[PDB]
Every structure is written in structure tokens, then in C-alpha cells.
């Protein structure tokens, strides 16, 4: 034993226990989800209201990269911010050299290689976040989810955090009941519902809902936060479904 | 060949009274035979009851004033909000100017 004391050490199984321990920090975090729709993507996150003293709608969790990519994550929030800062540098250098905005699959690998690099040495710690991200590019809509190991895949729907099992089950129903697809406005409503349903795992404290979206028709392929009437409409739809 | 220096004209005048001091300067800014501005402030209140004007090449003048104003701010931070005396400001400005001994600020300065 002692294989789990240092990062980048293979156990006799062929496992990197330090990365597996980073996953435990992710599982401890709040619930965040992603939904791929007809011409875009929708992101949503659970924000735990620890106290009344928290200013509503101020502690924003979802982050934009470039102008067409949205990023959300569960786990150690600072680690997520660090990853998004790098993502922004990667996106800027891509656009600097190649002119066009970074494609989502290209962007996904840039994050993937960076996270994977933090599993190669004992002088660094793996990332304590799973990141859900995506947007619209020339080839259409893309949704990705990235783990502490650097592993990522494309998704129809994605979920991570403490209420991921509940969320995943809900996402699987949408995939089955909508093979032709889901609209952007529908996806926002469904996203609200799923976060509310996933809140049963964090039912002690009440929470604040935060949603964002990129859609070719609804937002011109740019990342925007869901605000005001459209947000309230989604909250009402979500509250109606739990009762 | 690129000439990093220019001449923005202008004239300044400082006179020390018995219990007062004045620092005056014209507001005209020029290149060659053209007027850039009829009113471009050249004498500045830098805080701590000190006034300053860096006359000559305006870009170097604005840079020096900006750096001195900054030096006053950090003097407060580093030394418990102590007032920067005029003699101390003068010595500080010498070191700001001599840092570019081999690529000088092209200005005549008065405080």
C-alpha cells in the first residue's frame, strides 16, 4: 500500500487513486446539468442558499468562454474557475491564429489535455471538478462532460454532483420520449424541472435556480443567461411538476 | 527611421511666494505649425498640496505625472498615510527621471 498517497502512481490494479479521490470531491458538490436541444444547448445548476445573507442572483456559477461556449461544474468551485481561465486562453489563441471561433470538439480536447496533464505528475493535484460545457459552432450543437481523469465524451444529456443519479434518470426519459428532438424553450423548462427534482438529495437547505443557453434561433448561437420572465416561467413550470 | 520623440510646445512658470506658491502654464497643444487643442490642461494637482507640470513631449509628460501621482498613492499605503513633503516629492521625481537616463523623459518639469 501507499499507492494512493501520490498522484500519477499506478496501483497494482492499474488505477490512479488520487484521481478517484478527486471524483469524491465532485460527488460532494451541488447538482449541475446540461441538455442538448434541436439547435443548441441548455445549462442549469443548483445553488445552495447557505444563509439569508447571500445576495440573490449575485454569486453567478455558470461561466462563458469566448462568446459561444457555456461552462458549468460541480465540486471545488475554484478548480472550475481555474479550468475556465485556461479554456479562455485556449479559445483566444485558437481565434488569434485561425480567425474562426474555436469549435466545441476542438475546445473539449483543449480542456481534456490540460486536465489529463494534471494526472501525469506528483507535483500537481488533479482537478476537483466535473465540468459540463458546450455550445453552437459551424457543425451545430454540442454538449460535453469532462471528468477529473481528463476523460470526456459527447452527450445528449449530462449530469454531475450530489443529485446526479436522479438527474440522469430524468434525462434518460427525455431521450426516450423525444427521438425527433427537443426545442430550446422546452429544454429550459425541462432543465428547471430536473434541478428541482435533483434537489431532493440536498433537501435540507433551500436553493436558487440558475439557467443559461446557446441556441441558433433563440440566441443567435451566442451564450446568454436565462433572466426575468423566461426564468420565472421555467421556475413556475418546475414548481408545478413537483406538486 | 522612427523618431520616438516629439515637441508639443507649451510654456510653464513657477513662482514661490512667502507663504504661497503658483504654478502656471498655457493650455495650447501643438505639432509643427498646427494646433491640436486650445485647451489641454498641463498643470495638475497631484495631492498632498503639491502641483506639477511636465512640459515638452506630452506623451512623456503625461507618463511622468501619472507615475508621480501613483508614487504619492503608494507613499500613503507604505508609510501610514504620511503627507509627502515637497522636498521628498522632489527627490522621488529625480529617481523617476534618472531611471530612463539612457532613454529620457523629454520634459522640463516643475513642482
Amino acid at each position: 500500500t501507499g499507492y494512493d498517497l501520490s498522484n500519477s502512481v499506478f496501483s497494482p490494479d492499474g488505477r490512479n487513486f488520487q484521481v478517484e479521490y478527486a471524483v469524491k470531491a465532485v460527488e460532494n458538490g451541488t447538482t449541475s446539468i446540461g441538455i442538448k436541444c434541436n439547435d443548441g444547448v441548455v445549462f442549469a445548476v443548483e445553488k445552495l442558499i447557505t444563509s439569508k445573507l447571500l445576495v440573490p442572483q449575485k454569486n453567478v456559477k455558470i461561466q462563458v468562454v469566448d462568446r459561444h461556449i457555456g461552462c458549468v461544474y460541480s465540486g471545488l468551485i475554484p478548480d472550475g474557475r481555474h479550468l475556465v481561465n485556461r479554456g479562455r486562453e485556449e479559445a483566444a489563441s485558437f481565434k488569434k491564429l485561425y480567425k474562426t471561433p474555436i469549435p466545441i470538439p476542438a475546445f473539449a480536447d483543449r480542456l481534456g489535455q490540460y486536465v489529463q496533464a494534471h494526472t501525469l505528475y506528483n507535483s500537481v493535484r488533479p482537478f476537483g471538478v466535473s465540468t459540463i460545457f458546450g455550445g453552437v459552432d459551424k457543425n451545430g450543437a454540442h454538449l460535453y462532460m469532462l471528468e477529473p481523469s481528463g476523460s470526456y465524451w459527447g452527450y445528449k444529456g449530462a449530469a454531475t454532483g450530489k443529485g446526479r443519479q436522479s438527474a440522469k434518470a430524468e434525462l434518460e426519459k427525455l431521450v426516450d420520449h423525444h427521438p425527433e428532438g427537443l426545442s430550446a424553450r422546452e429544454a429550459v423548462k425541462q432543465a428547471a424541472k430536473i434541478i428541482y427534482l435533483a434537489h431532493e438529495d440536498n433537501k435540507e437547505k433551500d436553493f436558487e435556480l440558475e439557467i443559461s443557453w446557446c441556441s441558433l434561433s433563440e440566441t443567435n448561437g451566442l451564450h446568454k443567461f436565462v433572466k426575468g420572465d423566461l426564468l420565472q416561467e421555467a421556475i413556475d413550470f418546475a414548481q408545478k411538476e413537483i406538486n | 527611421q522612427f523618431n520616438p520623440y516629439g515637441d508639443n510646445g507649451g510654456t510653464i512658470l513657477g513662482i514661490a511666494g512667502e507663504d504661497f506658491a503658483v504654478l502656471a502654464g498655457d493650455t495650447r497643444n501643438i505639432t509643427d505649425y498646427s494646433i491640436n487643442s486650445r485647451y489641454e490642461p498641463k498643470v495638475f494637482d497631484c495631492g498632498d498640496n503639491i502641483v506639477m507640470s511636465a512640459n515638452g513631449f506630452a506623451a512623456d509628460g503625461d507618463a511622468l505625472v501619472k507615475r508621480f501621482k501613483n508614487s504619492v498613492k503608494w507613499y500613503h499605503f507604505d508609510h501610514n498615510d504620511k503627507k509627502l513633503s515637497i522636498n521628498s516629492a522632489a527627490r522621488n521625481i529625480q529617481h523617476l527621471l534618472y531611471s530612463r537616463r539612457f532613454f529620457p523623459y523629454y520634459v522640463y518639469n516643475i513642482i
Binding site: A117, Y121, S123, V124 | -
Partner: protein, 250 residues
């Protein structure tokens, strides 16, 4: 990041042993047998092509390697370590000699350069020693034919004949009885094949044996004519057919 292993990984133990070198020598012991014999008019180096799978094309894996036109090398131990040493040995022969003096290095000095590289992996920060022993055969104008062994420590010794790896103890005894100072190259090849048969279990033929010589100049392998002083490489790798022909007179 940064390589933060700036300290030695090989150190003296209380008994005066350098553990990592000893363990590297143990890895060499597990390796497939290879040998070298020096004749009056040449040198021969040989080993078994231990194929990991019958689907693998063992011709693509070269255990015997040309370092210079007149110098060749074979090993026992860890193959990957050998491969990178050959790359470095080929390069250092140019950078530290040919680009200075306009000619290829003599065997002993190329051996000295390879030895140095292996010594540094025994003392430098954040590295383990190379897990190979090399046998380097070669010829040069002023020293004639020569055969050298290089160990993981960086130590090297000249041999009339020797063997390393799996069945080296038995093979060295076999060579002591057969070797003399009047051997012709063909006699040395014959003895090499006899010695190597004892350590091989399975198939014993030109396709499972790798054998090369340092002998006469080969003007047919030079690739060009017109310069009298350039007469061709003395290193030559024996073909599968050439080995089988000598196995009938075995």
C-alpha cells in the same frame, strides 16, 4: 510540473553496494543470451531473435545494430533501453568525433562515449540506470579488430570472446575451451553457432538467429565508386540463408 527529481536515485547502501546498478545487472541476467568472439581477421557477434509472437515479424526488430560502418553492437536485457542507446551512440559518433576529425571514431573511444552515457544514468538526478549490457565489436586502422563489453555501471572491458545474459556462465566456459589466437573468421562463426545452440530451446535457424560480423571491407555495400581510399563498411549482417548454409556444416 518541472522535473523536481534533481537528486540521485542510485545511492550507496551501508554495505557499499549501489543497489540500482545491481538490480540492473539482474535484469541483464534474465535477458536472452548474446555473445561475441574475436578472430585474427574479424569479429563475430550473435544472439537469439526471441519472438514475442509468431504473428510478429521478427525481421523488423533488429537486436544487432550498426553504429558506424566498422562498428556493430548487440545486447542482453531490456530492449527499449538498448534501442535508445543505439540512437545516442550513433549520434555521439558524429557530434563528438566525425564532425571534428572528419573520420569515424575508433572502437574503444565510441565505447568510452557509450559508457559515459550509462555512467551518467547511474549518478544524475531523477533517472534509473540502463537495464542492458552491451557487446560492441569493431575495427579501426591503428587498433585493428576489437570486442568490448559495457555494463549498466558504465564499466567496460575488452574481450577475446565472451557471453552475456541468460546462459552466460555456461557459454563462457564453452568459449574458453574452443578459443585460440589463430582462429579465422569462419572458425569463429562456427564456434558462435555451436555456443549459441546450447542456450536456445526451440527453433534454431537463420530466421530465429541474428548474427553479424566485423571483417573485410565490402565495396559492394558502399553505394558508390570513384574514390580509391573509400573501400566500404567492415560491418555486415549475415542473411537468413547465409546462416542456414553454415548450419549444415555444423
Amino acid at each position: 510540473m518541472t522535473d523536481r527529481y534533481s537528486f540521485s536515485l542510485t545511492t550507496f547502501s551501508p554495505s557499499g553496494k549501489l543497489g540500482q546498478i545491481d538490480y540492473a545487472l539482474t535484469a541483464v541476467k534474465q535477458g536472452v543470451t548474446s555473445l561475441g568472439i574475436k578472430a585474427t581477421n574479424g569479429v563475430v557477434i550473435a544472439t537469439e531473435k526471441k519472438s514475442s509472437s509468431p504473428l510478429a515479424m521478427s525481421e523488423t526488430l533488429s537486436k544487432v545494430s550498426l553504429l558506424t560502418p566498422d562498428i556493430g553492437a548487440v545486447y542482453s536485457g531490456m530492449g527499449p533501453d538498448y534501442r535508445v542507446l543505439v540512437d545516442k551512440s550513433r549520434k555521439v559518433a558524429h557530434t563528438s568525433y566525425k564532425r571534428i576529425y572528419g573520420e569515424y571514431p575508433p572502437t574503444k573511444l565510441l565505447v568510452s562515449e557509450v559508457a559515459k552515457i550509462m555512467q551518467e544514468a547511474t549518478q544524475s538526478g531523477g533517472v534509473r540506470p540502463f537495464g542492458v549490457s552491451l557487446l560492441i565489436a569493431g575495427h579501426d586502422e591503428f587498433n585493428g579488430f576489437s570486442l568490448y563489453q559495457v555494463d549498466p555501471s558504465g564499466s567496460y572491458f575488452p574481450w577475446k570472446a565472451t557471453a552475456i545474459g541468460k546462459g552466460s556462465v555456461a557459454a563462457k566456459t564453452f568459449l574458453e575451451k574452443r578459443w585460440n589466437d589463430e582462429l579465422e573468421l569462419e572458425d569463429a562463426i562456427h564456434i558462435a553457432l555451436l555456443t549459441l545452440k546450447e542456450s536456445v530451446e526451440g527453433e534454431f535457424n537463420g530466421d530465429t538467429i541474428e548474427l553479424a560480423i566485423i571483417g573485410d571491407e565490402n565495396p559492394d555495400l558502399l553505394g558508390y565508386t570513384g574514390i580509391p581510399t573509400d573501400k566500404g563498411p567492415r560491418f555486415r549482417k549475415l542473411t537468413s540463408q547465409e546462416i542456414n548454409d553454415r548450419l549444415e556444416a555444423l
